[PDB]
Structure formats: C-alpha cells, structure tokens
C-alpha cells in the first residue's frame, strides 16, 4: 500500500516519538562507524552528533507511518520540520 507523496494526509511536523527513535537509530548507526554527513566540532558522544546532523536534516531515515487501515506513508527527514 504505497501512498503517493501528493496523497499523504498525515501531519508534516515530526513529533517527539519519531524524534527519539530516529536520534537513537542514527546515533547507533554512527556508533557502528557510519560516515558522518556534517563537520565535526570535537563531539565524542554520537547522540550529540545525531542532533547536530539532525539540525541540517541530512539523516537517511525513512519513517513508515502506519495508518489504521493497514496502509503506510513514507516520510523523509528533510520533508519534516524541526520543532521543540
């Protein structure tokens, strides 16, 4: 059930339940020595690297939001807008 991009009716604002898991998964990926997309300013805790590369929205994670009718919408990181 691939929902088209113009057909997506979910919200365009990424909530904190997505934020925690994307931050943890990306920091874990960096913890297995993934390439870091942005410049490093001496940070050694990869969770901090996960935030400071989430600021420029350069994280390759596709969020598969599940609708109640067993259909799924794929949302990218840069399509969603940071809010806190």
């Amino acid at each position: 059930g691939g929902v088209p991009k113009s057909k997506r009716i979910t919200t365009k604002y990424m909530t904190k339940y997505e934020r925690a898991r994307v931050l943890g998964t990306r920091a874990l990926q960096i913890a297995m020595c993934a390439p870091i997309m942005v410049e490093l300013d001496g940070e050694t805790d990869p969770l901090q690297i996960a935030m400071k590369e989430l600021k420029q929205k350069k994280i390759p994670i596709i969020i598969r939001r599940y609708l109640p009718d067993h259909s799924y919408e794929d949302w990218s990181i840069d399509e969603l807008i940071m809010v806190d």
Partner: protein, 147 residues
C-alpha cells in the same frame, strides 16, 4: 540503567524530568518550591528586607545562568544596598509577565485607590522577566496553574 544507547536517547528525549514538568492530568506543574526554601522565598521578598553588597555578593555565584552583569543597587547613598526582589530578578530568565495575589491579600484592597500601590505588599506583579512587586508564596511559586 539502560543497556542500549537508543533507549538512552529515548530517556533523554522523553523520560527526562524538565520535559515532564506539566501534568496532562490537571495542566499544572508537579514539582514546586517547598519547605524552608519556600518559607525563605516568602521571607526574602518582603519590603523591609534590605540586603547589603556583601550578602548579595555571596548570593551571586550560585546563579550559573547569570550574565556577569550586576544590577545597580536600589539604595546608592550613603550605603549601597540591594533588595530581595532585585536579586530574585536575576534568577528569573527571559520575558516573564505575571499577575497574582498573596494568600493574605484583603479583598477590599482591589476596589480601593491603593490597588496598584499596596502598603501590605500583597499583589504580586512580574514584568519583563524581573521581579517588581509582591511577596511570593505557594500561589505564585507552587504547583498551582498560572504560577
């Protein structure tokens, strides 16, 4: 202790204390200033509390968010003296504006001519993130809504 660091990220982004300040049960804070800390907040905002340069100097280093810009004293001559509201003003950050009343506020004061100048220092006014008027209590620095 979390044994996976993505769960540690979940603790940081969800389970941390400052992200859980306001309850969804009754839209109120759950932590508050209590016991002798609240008692000395009540006793420190009083109008007769005139505090010297040395004592506010002692109180200065316990504000790590301070911008190292000390205020001009309320009393300049003959002795430089501060007050309790002037040093609680440094604690309050940002733009904070607030109207409440003390628990010992008379009801006849609000319709009188002294509703904006209280002899008893009861109505509590905060303007622009600095403490201006009133003595704080459980109503202003507690778990109640609108604090």
């Amino acid at each position: 202790v979390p044994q996976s660091m993505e769960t540690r990220a979940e603790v940081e982004n969800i389970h941390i204390t400052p992200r859980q300040i306001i309850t969804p049960q009754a839209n109120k804070p759950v932590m508050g200033i209590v016991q002798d800390t609240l008692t000395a907040v009540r006793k420190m905002t009083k109008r007769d509390v005139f505090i010297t340069r040395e004592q506010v100097m002692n109180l200065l280093m316990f504000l790590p968010t301070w911008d190292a810009k000390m205020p001009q004293p309320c009393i300049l001559k003959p002795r430089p003296l501060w007050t309790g509201k002037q040093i609680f003003s440094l604690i309050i950050p940002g733009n904070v504006n607030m109207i409440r009343t003390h628990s010992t506020h008379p009801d006849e004061e609000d319709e009188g001519p002294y509703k904006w100048i209280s002899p008893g220092d009861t109505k509590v006014m905060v303007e622009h993130g600095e403490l201006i008027m009133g003595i704080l209590c459980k109503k202003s620095l507690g778990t109640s809504a609108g604090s």
